[PDB]
Every structure is written in structure tokens, then in C-alpha cells.
PDB file of C-alpha atoms and ligand atoms in Angstrom:
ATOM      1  CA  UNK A   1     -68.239 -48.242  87.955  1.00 32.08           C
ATOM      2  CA  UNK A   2     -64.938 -47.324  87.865  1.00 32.52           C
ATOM      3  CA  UNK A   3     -63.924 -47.601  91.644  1.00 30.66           C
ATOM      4  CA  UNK A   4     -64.832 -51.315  91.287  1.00 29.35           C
ATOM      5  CA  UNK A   5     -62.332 -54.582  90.510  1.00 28.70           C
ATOM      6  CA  UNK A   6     -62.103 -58.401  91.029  1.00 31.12           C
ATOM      7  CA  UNK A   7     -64.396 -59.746  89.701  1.00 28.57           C
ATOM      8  CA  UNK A   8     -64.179 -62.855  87.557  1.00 29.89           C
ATOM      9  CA  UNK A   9     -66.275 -64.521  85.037  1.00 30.21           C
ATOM     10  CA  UNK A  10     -65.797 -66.181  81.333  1.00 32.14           C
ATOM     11  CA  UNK A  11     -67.107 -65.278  77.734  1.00 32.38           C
ATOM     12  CA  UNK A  12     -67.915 -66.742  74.438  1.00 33.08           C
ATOM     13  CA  UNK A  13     -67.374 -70.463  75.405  1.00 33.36           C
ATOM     14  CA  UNK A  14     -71.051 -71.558  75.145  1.00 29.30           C
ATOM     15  CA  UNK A  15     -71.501 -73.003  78.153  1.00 26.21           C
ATOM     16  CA  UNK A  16     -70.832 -71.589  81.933  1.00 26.64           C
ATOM     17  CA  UNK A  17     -67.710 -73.463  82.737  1.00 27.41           C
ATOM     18  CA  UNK A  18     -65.704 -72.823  79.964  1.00 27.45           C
ATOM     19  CA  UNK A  19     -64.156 -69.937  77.982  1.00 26.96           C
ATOM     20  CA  UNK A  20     -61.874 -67.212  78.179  1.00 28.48           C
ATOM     21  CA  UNK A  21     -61.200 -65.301  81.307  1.00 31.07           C
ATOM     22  CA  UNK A  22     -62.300 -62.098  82.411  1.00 33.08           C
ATOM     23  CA  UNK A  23     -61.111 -60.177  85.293  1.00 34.04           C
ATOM     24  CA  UNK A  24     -62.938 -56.700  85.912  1.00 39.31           C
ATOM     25  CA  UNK A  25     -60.491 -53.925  86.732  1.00 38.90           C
ATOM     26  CA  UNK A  26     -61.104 -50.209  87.708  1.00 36.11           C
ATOM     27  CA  UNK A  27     -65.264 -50.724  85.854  1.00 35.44           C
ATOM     28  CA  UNK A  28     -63.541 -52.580  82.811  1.00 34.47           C
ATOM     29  CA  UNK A  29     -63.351 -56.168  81.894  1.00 32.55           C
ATOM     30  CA  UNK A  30     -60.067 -57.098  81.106  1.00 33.60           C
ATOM     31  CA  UNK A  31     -58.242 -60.180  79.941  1.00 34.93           C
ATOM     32  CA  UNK A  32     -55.637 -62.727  80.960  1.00 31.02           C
ATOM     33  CA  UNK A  33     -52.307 -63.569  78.647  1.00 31.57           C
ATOM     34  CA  UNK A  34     -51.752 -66.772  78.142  1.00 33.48           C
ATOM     35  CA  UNK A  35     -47.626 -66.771  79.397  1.00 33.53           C
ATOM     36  CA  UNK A  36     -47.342 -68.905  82.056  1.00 36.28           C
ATOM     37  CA  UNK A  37     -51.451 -69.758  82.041  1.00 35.66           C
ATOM     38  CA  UNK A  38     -51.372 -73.625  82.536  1.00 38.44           C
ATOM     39  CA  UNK A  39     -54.319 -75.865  84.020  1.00 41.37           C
ATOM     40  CA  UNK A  40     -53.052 -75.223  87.767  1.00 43.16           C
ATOM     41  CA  UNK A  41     -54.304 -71.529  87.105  1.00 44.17           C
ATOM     42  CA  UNK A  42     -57.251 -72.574  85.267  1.00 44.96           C
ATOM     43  CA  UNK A  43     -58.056 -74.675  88.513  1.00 45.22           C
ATOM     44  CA  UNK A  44     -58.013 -71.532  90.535  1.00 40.88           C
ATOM     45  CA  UNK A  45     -60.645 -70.220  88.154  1.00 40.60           C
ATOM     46  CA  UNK A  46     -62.635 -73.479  88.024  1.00 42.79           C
ATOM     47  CA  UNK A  47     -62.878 -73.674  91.623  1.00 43.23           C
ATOM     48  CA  UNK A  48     -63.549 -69.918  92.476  1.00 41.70           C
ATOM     49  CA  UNK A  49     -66.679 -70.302  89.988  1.00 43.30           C
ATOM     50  CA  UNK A  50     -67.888 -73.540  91.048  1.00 43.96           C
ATOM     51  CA  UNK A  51     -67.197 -74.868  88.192  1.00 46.40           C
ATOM     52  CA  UNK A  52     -65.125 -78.043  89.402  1.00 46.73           C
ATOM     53  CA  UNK A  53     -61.829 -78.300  88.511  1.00 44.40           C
ATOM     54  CA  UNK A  54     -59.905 -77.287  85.388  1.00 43.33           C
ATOM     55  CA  UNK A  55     -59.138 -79.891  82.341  1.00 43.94           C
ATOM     56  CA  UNK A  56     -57.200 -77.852  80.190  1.00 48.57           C
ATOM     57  CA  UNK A  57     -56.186 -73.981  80.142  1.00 48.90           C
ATOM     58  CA  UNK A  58     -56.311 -73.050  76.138  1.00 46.51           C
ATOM     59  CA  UNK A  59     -53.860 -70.377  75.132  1.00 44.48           C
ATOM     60  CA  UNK A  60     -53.925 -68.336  72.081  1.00 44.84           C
ATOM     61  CA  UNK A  61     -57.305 -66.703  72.204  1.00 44.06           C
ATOM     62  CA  UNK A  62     -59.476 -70.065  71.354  1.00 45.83           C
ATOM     63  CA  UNK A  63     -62.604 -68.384  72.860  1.00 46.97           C
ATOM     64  CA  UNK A  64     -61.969 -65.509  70.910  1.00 47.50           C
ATOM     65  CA  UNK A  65     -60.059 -62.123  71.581  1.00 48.81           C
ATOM     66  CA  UNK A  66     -61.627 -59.363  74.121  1.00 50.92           C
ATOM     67  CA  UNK A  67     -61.687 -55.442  74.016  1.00 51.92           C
ATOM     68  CA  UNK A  68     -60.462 -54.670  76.855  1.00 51.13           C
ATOM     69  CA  UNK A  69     -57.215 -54.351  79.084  1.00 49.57           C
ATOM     70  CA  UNK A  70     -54.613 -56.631  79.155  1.00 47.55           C
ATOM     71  CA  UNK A  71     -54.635 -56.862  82.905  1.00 47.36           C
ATOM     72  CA  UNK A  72     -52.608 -59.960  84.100  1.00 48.34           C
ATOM     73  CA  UNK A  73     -49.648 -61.804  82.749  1.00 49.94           C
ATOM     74  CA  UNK A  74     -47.343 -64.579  83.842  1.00 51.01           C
ATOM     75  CA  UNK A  75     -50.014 -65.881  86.420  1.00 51.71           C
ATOM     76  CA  UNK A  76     -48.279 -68.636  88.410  1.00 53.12           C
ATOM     77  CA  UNK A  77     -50.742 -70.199  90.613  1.00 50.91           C
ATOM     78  CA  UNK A  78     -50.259 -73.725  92.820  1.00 49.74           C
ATOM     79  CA  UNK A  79     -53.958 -74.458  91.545  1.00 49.45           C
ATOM     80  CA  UNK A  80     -54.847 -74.550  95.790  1.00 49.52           C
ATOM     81  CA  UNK A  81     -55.365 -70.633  96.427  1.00 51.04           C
ATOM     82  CA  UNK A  82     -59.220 -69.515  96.685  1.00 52.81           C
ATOM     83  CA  UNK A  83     -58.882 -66.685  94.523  1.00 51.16           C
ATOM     84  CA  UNK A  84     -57.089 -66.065  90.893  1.00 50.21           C
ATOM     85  CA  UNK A  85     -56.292 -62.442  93.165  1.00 53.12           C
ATOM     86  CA  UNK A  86     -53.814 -64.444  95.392  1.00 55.02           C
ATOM     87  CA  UNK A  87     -51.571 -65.777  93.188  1.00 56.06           C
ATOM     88  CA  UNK A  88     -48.033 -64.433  92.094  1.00 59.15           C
ATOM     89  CA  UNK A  89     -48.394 -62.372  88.574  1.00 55.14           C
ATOM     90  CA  UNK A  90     -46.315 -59.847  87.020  1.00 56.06           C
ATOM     91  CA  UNK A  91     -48.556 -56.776  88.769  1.00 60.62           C
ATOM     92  CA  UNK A  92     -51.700 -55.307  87.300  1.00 63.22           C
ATOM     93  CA  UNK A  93     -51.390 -54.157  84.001  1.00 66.63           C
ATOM     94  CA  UNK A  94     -48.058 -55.517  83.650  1.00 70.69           C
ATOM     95  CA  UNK A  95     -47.974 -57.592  80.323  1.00 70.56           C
ATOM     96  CA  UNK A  96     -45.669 -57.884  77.049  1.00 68.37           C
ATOM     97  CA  UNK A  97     -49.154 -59.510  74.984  1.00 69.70           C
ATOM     98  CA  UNK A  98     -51.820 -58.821  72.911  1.00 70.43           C
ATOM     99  CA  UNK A  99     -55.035 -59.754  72.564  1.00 69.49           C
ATOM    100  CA  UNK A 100     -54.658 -62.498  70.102  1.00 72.38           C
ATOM    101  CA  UNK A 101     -52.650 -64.221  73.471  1.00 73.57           C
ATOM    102  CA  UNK A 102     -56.383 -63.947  75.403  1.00 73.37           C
ATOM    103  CA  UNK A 103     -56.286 -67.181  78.118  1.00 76.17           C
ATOM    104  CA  UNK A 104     -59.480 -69.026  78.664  1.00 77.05           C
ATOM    105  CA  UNK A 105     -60.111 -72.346  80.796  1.00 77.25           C
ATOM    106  CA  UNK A 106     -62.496 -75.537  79.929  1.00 78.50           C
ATOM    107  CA  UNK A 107     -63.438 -76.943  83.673  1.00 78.35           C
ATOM    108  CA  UNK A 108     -64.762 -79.743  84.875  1.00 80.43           C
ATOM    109  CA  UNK A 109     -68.399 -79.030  85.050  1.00 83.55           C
ATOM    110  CA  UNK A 110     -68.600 -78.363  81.716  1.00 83.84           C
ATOM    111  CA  UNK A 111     -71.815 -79.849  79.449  1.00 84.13           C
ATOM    112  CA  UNK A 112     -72.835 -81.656  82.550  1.00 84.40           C
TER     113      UNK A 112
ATOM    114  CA  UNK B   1     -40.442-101.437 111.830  1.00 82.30           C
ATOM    115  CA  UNK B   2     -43.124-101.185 114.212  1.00 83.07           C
ATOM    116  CA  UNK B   3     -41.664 -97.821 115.906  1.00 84.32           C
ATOM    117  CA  UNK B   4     -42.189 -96.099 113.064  1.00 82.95           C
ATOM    118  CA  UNK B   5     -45.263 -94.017 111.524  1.00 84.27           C
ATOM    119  CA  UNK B   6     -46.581 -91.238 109.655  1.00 84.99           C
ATOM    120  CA  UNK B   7     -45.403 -91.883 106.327  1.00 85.56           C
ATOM    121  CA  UNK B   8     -48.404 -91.922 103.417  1.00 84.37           C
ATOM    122  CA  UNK B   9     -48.706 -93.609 100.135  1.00 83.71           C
ATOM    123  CA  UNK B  10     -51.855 -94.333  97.630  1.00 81.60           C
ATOM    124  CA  UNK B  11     -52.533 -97.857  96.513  1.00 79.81           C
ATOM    125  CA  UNK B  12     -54.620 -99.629  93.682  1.00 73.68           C
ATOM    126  CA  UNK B  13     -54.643 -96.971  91.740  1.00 73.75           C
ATOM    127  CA  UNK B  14     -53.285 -97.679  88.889  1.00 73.72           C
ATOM    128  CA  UNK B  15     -51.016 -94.766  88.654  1.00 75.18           C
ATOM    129  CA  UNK B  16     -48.891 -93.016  91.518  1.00 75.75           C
ATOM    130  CA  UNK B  17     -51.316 -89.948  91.878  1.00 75.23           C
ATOM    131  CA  UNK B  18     -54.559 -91.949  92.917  1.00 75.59           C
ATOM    132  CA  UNK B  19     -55.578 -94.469  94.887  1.00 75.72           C
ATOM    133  CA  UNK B  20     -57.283 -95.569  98.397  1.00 76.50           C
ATOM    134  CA  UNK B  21     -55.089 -93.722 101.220  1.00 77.56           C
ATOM    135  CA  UNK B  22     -52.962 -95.481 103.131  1.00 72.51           C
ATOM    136  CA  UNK B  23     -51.193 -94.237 106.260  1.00 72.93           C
ATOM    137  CA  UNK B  24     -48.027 -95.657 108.386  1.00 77.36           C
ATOM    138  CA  UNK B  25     -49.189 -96.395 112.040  1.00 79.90           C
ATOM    139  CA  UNK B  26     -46.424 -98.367 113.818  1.00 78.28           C
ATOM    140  CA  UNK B  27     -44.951-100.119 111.260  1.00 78.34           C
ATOM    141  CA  UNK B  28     -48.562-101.272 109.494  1.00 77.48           C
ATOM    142  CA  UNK B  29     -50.046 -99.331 106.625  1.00 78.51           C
ATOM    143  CA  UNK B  30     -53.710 -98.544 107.760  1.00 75.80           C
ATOM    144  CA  UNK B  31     -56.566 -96.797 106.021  1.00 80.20           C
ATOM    145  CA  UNK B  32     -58.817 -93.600 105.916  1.00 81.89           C
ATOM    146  CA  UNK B  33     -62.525 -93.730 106.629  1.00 83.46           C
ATOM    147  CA  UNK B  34     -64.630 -91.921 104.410  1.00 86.29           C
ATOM    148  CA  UNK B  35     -66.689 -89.959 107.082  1.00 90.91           C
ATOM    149  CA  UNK B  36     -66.058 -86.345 106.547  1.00 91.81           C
ATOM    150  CA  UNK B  37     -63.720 -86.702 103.518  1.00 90.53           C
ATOM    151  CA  UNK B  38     -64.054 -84.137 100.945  1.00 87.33           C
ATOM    152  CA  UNK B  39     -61.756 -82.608  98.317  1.00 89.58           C
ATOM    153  CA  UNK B  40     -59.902 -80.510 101.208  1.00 91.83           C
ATOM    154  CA  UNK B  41     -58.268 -83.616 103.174  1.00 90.73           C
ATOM    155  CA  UNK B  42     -57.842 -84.381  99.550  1.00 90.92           C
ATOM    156  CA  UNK B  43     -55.732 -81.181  98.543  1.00 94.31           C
ATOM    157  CA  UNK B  44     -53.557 -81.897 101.765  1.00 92.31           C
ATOM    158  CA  UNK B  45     -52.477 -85.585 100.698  1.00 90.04           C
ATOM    159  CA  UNK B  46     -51.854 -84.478  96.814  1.00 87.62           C
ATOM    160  CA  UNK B  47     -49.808 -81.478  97.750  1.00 90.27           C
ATOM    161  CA  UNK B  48     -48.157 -83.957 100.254  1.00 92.53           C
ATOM    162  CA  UNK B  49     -47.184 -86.665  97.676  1.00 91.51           C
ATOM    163  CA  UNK B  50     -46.025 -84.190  94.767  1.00 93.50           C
ATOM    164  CA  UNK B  51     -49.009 -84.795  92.564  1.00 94.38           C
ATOM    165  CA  UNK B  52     -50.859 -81.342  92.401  1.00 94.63           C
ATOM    166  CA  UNK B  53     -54.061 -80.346  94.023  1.00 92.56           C
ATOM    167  CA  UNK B  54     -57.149 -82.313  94.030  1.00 89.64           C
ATOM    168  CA  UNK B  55     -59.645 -83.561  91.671  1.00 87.94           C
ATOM    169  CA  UNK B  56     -62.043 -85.424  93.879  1.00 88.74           C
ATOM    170  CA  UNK B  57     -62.175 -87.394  97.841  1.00 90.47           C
ATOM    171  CA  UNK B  58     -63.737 -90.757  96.632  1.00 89.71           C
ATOM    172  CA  UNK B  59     -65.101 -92.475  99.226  1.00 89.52           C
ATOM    173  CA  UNK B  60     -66.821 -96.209  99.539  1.00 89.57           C
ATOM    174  CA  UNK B  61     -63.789 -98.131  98.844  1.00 88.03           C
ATOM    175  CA  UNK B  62     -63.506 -96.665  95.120  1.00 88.57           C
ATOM    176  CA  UNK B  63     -60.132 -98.257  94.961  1.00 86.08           C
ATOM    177  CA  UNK B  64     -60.578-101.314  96.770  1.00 87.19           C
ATOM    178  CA  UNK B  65     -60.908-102.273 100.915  1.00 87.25           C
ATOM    179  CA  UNK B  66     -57.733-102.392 102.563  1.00 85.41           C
ATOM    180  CA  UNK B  67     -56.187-104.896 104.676  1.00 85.99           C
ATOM    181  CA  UNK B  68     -54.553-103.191 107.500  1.00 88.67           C
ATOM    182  CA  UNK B  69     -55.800-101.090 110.353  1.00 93.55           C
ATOM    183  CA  UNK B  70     -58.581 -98.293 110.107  1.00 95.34           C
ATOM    184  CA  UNK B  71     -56.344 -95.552 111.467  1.00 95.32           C
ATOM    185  CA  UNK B  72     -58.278 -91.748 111.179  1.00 98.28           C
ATOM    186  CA  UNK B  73     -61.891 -91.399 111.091  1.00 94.40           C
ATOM    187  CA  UNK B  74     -63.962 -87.342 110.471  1.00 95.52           C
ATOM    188  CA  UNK B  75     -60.681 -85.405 109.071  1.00 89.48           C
ATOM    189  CA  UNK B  76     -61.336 -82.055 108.940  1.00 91.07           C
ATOM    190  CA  UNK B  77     -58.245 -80.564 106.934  1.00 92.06           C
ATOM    191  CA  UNK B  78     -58.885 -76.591 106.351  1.00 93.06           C
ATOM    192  CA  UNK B  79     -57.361 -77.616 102.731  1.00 94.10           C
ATOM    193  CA  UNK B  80     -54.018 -75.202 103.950  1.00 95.00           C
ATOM    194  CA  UNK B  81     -52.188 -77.769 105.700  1.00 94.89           C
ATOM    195  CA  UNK B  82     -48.764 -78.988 104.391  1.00 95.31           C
ATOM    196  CA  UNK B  83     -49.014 -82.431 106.656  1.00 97.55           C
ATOM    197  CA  UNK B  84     -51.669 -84.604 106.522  1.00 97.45           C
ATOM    198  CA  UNK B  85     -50.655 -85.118 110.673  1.00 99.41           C
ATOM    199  CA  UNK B  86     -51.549 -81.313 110.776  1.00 96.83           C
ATOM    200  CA  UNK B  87     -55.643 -81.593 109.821  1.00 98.43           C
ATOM    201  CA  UNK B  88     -57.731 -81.923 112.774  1.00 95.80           C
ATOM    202  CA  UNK B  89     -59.419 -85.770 113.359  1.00 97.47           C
ATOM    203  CA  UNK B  90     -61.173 -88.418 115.484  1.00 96.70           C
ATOM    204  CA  UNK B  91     -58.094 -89.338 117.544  1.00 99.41           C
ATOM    205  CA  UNK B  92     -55.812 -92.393 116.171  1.00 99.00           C
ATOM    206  CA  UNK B  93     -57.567 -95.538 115.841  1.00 98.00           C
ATOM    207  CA  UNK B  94     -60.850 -94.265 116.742  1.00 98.64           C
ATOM    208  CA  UNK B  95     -63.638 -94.428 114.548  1.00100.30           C
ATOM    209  CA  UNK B  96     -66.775 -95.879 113.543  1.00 98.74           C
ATOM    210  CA  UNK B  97     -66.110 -97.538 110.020  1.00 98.36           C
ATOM    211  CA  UNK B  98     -65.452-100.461 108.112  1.00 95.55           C
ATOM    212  CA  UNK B  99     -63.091-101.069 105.143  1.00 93.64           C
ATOM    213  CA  UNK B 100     -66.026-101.022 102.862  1.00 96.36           C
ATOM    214  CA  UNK B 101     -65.831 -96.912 103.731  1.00 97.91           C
ATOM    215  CA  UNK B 102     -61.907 -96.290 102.583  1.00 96.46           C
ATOM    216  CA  UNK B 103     -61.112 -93.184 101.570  1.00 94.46           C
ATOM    217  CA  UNK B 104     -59.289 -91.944  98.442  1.00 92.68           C
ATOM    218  CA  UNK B 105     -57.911 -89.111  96.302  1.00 92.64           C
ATOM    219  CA  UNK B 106     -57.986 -88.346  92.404  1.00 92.46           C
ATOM    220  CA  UNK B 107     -54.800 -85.976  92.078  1.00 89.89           C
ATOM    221  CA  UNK B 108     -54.189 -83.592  88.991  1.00 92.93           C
ATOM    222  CA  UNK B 109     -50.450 -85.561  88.355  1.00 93.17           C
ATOM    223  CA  UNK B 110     -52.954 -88.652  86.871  1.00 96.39           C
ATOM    224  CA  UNK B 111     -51.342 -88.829  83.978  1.00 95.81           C
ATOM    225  CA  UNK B 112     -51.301 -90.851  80.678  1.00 94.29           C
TER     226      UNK B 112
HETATM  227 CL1  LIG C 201     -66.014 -76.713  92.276  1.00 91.01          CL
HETATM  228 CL1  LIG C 202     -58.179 -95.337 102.952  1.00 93.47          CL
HETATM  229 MG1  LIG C 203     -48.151 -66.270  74.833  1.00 93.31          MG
HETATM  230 MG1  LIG C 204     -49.041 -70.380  85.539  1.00 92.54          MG
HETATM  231 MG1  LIG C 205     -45.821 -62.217  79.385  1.00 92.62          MG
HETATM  232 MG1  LIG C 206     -68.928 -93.290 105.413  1.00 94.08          MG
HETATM  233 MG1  LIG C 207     -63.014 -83.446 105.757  1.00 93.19          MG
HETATM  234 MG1  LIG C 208     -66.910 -91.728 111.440  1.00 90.92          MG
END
């Protein structure tokens, strides 16, 4: 419902450890831009999902675009904080993207 | 010299962002056992060195047995600390290893 936000999964990769990036925001799954989104970010969302750690953070909506929000941009993590939620972004909502700049990550874990 | 310690490097590696841990104690470069070593003491000694956050903590002498002194034994790093010094441990020099046990550390900076 819509009281309910952060929470994190990823879509249309074929396979649980890769794809692009979800973040669900006010009951609505939203979407990542890829400014700034580089494979210490991607290792945020690797290890938050158990998914190992990240190889490569794909740009340019190679999992395909989503529907909803544009929720984070410029996400600059270290790649050591537990949750995508701690890291420095431009505030929620904040973006200057569309959906055809959808982020996704391709983590360790992957195949297996 | 032999006054000085607490200074870190990785050896055998074949590239400056992994290797088997080695750590000053006064004036000889000692190992790491593997008991307790996991990808958090690994996070502390990548941040440490400049080469990113951590892939994996191999353990049984991965990258070869060192020569010098077995120097921490059980680290316990939280995976926050900015010192490798900082993570709690065994007590210097007091453990219950062998060099076929060395630890090591698979940083993100690998590079090629
Ligand atoms: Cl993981
Ligand atoms: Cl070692
Ligand atoms: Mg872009
Ligand atoms: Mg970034
Ligand atoms: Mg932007
Ligand atoms: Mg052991
Ligand atoms: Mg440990
Ligand atoms: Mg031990």
C-alpha cells in the first residue's frame, strides 16, 4: 500500500541476481537512473540481496525500461553501506532522466 | 627498522589489490591466520589500501605461505572500521595456526 517504501528487488534479467533495479516508494515500484550508477552502487545492491557482489552496473535501460517513478538519481555509494537507502543521492524523486536511462546490476551470483 | 609496525601490504598477488595479507610487526612483515576471516576483515584492509570494498577473504594460503611471523589470529572486524588495528582480535602473536592457514583479500581495484 501506499504508506509503504524501501524495498528493493530486480526485473526482467532472467535470473535472480541480475537486472534492473527496483526500489518501492509510497506502494509503487520505481526505478533508478543510471547518472552516477557505477559497480560500487551495484555492490550495495548485490550485497543487500545476497546476491554476492556486483560485476558490472549496465546503464541505459539493458533490462528493459519500467513504468513507474523515477525515484533516485546520482546514487553515489562507497559499495560498503548495508543498504542502497544509506547512500548519498540527489533526494527522492529528484532526477533530470527518463526511463530509457533505467539502471540495472549483473552480480556475482549470477547463473551459479 | 625493528621499532616500527602497523603498516599493511598484499603480496603474491599478482596485482596491487590482492594477495595474502601481510602486516608490519617490529620491523618484520608477518601474516594473517585464516580463523575467523570473512569478507568483513576483508572490507577493512581494501578500504585501507585504496582498492575498493571486498570481493572475497580467501583463506588456506590461496596466495602462497608466508615467511615471516604469524601476527593476528580470530579478527573480528564489524566491516566499519577505517584501521585494520581498530577490528577486535586474538592479542598480537597469539594464535593457533600455521602458514598453510594465511589469510587473503580479493579487492574490487583487481584490474586488467
Ligand atoms: Cl552476498
Ligand atoms: Cl596472511
Ligand atoms: Mg544517463
Ligand atoms: Mg555512483
Ligand atoms: Mg541525473
Ligand atoms: Mg583455519
Ligand atoms: Mg572475521
Ligand atoms: Mg585461531
Amino acid at each position: 500500500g501506499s504508506e509503504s517504501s524501501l524495498a528493493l528487488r530486480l526485473v526482467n534479467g532472467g535470473d535472480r541476481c541480475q537486472g534492473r533495479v527496483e526500489v518501492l516508494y509510497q506502494g509503487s515500484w520505481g526505478t533508478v537512473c543510471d547518472d552516477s550508477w557505477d559497480t560500487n552502487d551495484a555492490n550495495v545492491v548485490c550485497r543487500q540481496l545476497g546476491c554476492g557482489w556486483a560485476m558490472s552496473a549496465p546503464g541505459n535501460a539493458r533490462f528493459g525500461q519500467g513504468s513507474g517513478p523515477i525515484v533516485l538519481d546520482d546514487v553515489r555509494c562507497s559499495g560498503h553501506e548495508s543498504y542502497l537507502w544509506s547512500c548519498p543521492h540527489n533526494g527522492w524523486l529528484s532526477h533530470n532522466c527518463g526511463h530509457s536511462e533505467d539502471a540495472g546490476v549483473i552480480c556475482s551470483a549470477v547463473n551459479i
